Symmetry: D2
Subunit: 116 residues, 4 copies
């Protein structure tokens, strides 16, 4: 897991399951290029997004589709999604976890970065 | 007032209104001495808790009755209450705001200390 | 003003002052149209961004320049910026406050919507 | 892990290591009785606090010693500790994770509850 995403639900006190996540990388021409995507498991985790070789230096955007999540639960939330943008691997390879906590009108995100 | 409390509701996206709050100060024997209390306003704020003269250095506890708040909304919450415990320290002019953000199974709190 | 932004610093326990904020509205072609911008005040607030007349229903993006903020404090942060994206919906009288709490490697945001 | 504690550091973007945690249970006479204690590992996790048999119904308090944590790092924080109080196992046994995110002037806590 060079790149992992973990999402919790603050209303249910449980993992946020079936959350769609799209990752983008900024291209040489300054637009967002699709990089990888997936959905969280029953444990609220999303592995297998990429590999060390493909996860090169760059500016990455991790979009967590919180609206589609609350909508699938029949709830009316506020945010379109939770967007996490960061430079990665500019000092060599690292392993990144993006952790997120969701409520209908609020979210928090945190990064855990470790050296392999 | 050197001490103020602000409470927000992360589910409804608004202030948390009519939430009971109890403040205590740690006594010499390590027990919690009632210090001040009230209910948050329409703005989720609790003003006039204390004065400069009464608010001396020491350890204080701010107890927020989150359980009753959630129950009144028809929701079963996790925590019995939310407790914020900190040291008040003279080291320049100061006003303490204890902010809290509530969800049924989570809460966050931050201290905003200004001159 | 139906839109206001409040920013706090979880490390120093105080408002985040002089932080650049840019607001954008989603255009028909799905691009982000500059809408309003400014720097937070001594209270960590950004008032007078827009008016009722200009603030119509739609999708808006609030971009907070957290990277420059941390760099000015001598700290290397994780995020390039903090982006808050939401739909403004008429469904009664409303005032939107977008609150954000910043740490070098984390941020949280809540919408406080009142009548 | 009937009871687990996980703690992250929002300044370093890493697990909060060597964090002391004390757990108490309210006794019949309404005072806080020591129940278990430990410190977080290099992964910021604390397992082995108790067993299903010993973790009976009751009101529990999980105290995370954030002051001793920031002090050990030579930092001046605000909170004495992060205190998490909850009723557990009143509908039969559950597995509880208390997750916490720490900054010098702020903390957030979340509960994840699952049925074994």
């Amino acid at each position: 897991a060079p790149l992992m995403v973990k999402v919790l639900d603050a209303v249910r006190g449980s993992p946020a399951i079936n959350v769609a996540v799209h990752v983008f990388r900024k291209a040489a021409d300054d637009t967002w290029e699709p990089f990888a995507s997936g959905k969280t498991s029953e444990s609220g985790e999303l592995h297998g997004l990429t590999t060390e070789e493909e996860f090169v230096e760059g500016i990455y955007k991790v979009e967590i589709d919180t609206k589609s999540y609350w909508k699938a639960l029949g709830i009316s939330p506020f945010h379109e999604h939770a967007e996490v943008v960061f430079t990665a691997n500019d000092s060599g390879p690292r392993r990144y976890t993006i952790a997120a906590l969701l409520s209908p009108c609020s979210y928090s995100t945190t990064a855990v970065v470790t050296n392999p």
